[PDB]
Amino acid sequence: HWGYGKHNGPEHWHKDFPIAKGERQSPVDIDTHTAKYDPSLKPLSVSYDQATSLRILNNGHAFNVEFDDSQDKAVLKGGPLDGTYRLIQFHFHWGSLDGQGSEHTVDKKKYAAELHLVHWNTKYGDFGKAVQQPDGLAVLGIFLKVGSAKPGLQKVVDVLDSIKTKGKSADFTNFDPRGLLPESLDYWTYPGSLTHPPLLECVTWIVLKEPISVSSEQVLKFRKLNFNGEGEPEELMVDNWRPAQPLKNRQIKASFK
Ligand SMILES: [Zn+2]
């Protein structure tokens, strides 16, 4: 099955998922000088006041913090979007060392990690229908750099010991994803895809300019997770990022100058 290794990683995905070589794949390098400032782009509206986290899951690739998406409680709107997108989960991608881990790059710079908050367009009724549509998902991407600790991350870090291995989950209620946001909501945006299989070309990407800072200790706890299941040979969960893909016939727009 697919993964991040030599034998099943990004360079192999196209064999089971041909859309890997498609026209709107993600992530991409963001060339800051080429990105067009678009004064028509609206401020991002992030309304997470009523977010209901339920559970955290080690799915063998990363960990997902899941939300109750059975009502409009945690939604993304505005920005480049038309209509309302409901938060379903967030997860991260990270490296074996602090010099790699992000999926998007900025002028070829790699950050230590990247957070993806995944939302689906309510006009399609459910996530599985939304991913079949070119405007089905809005993913908010946030870079992580290593420096000061992120206090709002610590609850996530401290549950990871209980989901070390693939297929482990744990109750994870009352977590507030607002604590993972940077000060500014300035962004870049472009049409793309899921960054892991099935690689569906259904995402409006919204990548924030301002990274969050996490501590070295925080990131080191990410790197103690396992890709393998309980009892299986230990393979540390590191380098679970897809590299930048060709931009092809796409324009990256900036909300800011
Ligand atoms: Zn992701």
UniProtKB/Swiss-Prot annotation:
Effect listed in the UniProt record for changing residue 116 to E: Strongly reduced activity
Keywords noted in UniProt: Acetylation, Cell membrane, Cytoplasm, Disease variant, Lyase, Membrane, Metal-binding, Osteopetrosis, Phosphoprotein, Zinc
Disease: Osteopetrosis, autosomal recessive 3: A rare genetic disease characterized by abnormally dense bone, due to defective resorption of immature bone. Osteopetrosis occurs in two forms: a severe autosomal recessive form occurring in utero, infancy, or childhood, and a benign autosomal dominant form occurring in adolescence or adulthood. Recessive osteopetrosis commonly manifests in early infancy with macrocephaly, feeding difficulties, evolving blindness and deafness, bone marrow failure, severe anemia, and hepatosplenomegaly.
Regulation: Activated by X-ray, histamine, L-adrenaline, L- and D-phenylalanine, L- and D-histidine, L-His-OMe and beta-Ala-His (carnosine).
Outcome of substituting residue 194 to E/H/R: Strongly reduced CO(2) hydrase activity
EC number(s) given by UniProt: 4.2.1.1, 4.2.1.69
Effect upon mutating residue 59 to A: Reduced activity
Known outcome of mutating residue 89 to P: In OPTB3; in Czechoslovakia
Family listed: Belongs to the alpha-carbonic anhydrase family.
Organism: Homo sapiens
Record annotation: effect of changing residue 103 to A/Q: Strongly reduced CO(2) hydrase activity
Stated consequence of mutating residue 59 to D: Strongly reduced activity
Effect seen on changing residue 103 to D: Normal CO(2) hydrase activity
Highest taxon in the source lineage: Eukaryota
Residues at the site labelled Involved in the binding of some activators, including histamine and L-histidine: 89
Outcome of swapping residue 64 to L: Reduced activity
Stated name of the protein: Carbonic anhydrase 2
Domain Alpha-carbonic anhydrase span(s) in chain numbering: 1-256
Cofactor stoichiometry and binding remark: Zinc. Can also use cobalt(II) with lower efficiency, but not copper(II), nickel(II) and manganese(II).
Originating gene: CA2
Variant or mutagenesis effect after changing residue 195 to S/V: Reduced activity
Outcome following mutation: residue 118 to A/G/I/L/S: Reduced CO(2) hydrase and p-nitrophenyl acetate esterase activities
Result after altering residue 61 to G: Impaired activity, not rescued by 4-methylimidazole (4-MI)
Effect of residue 141 to R: In OPTB3; complete loss of activity
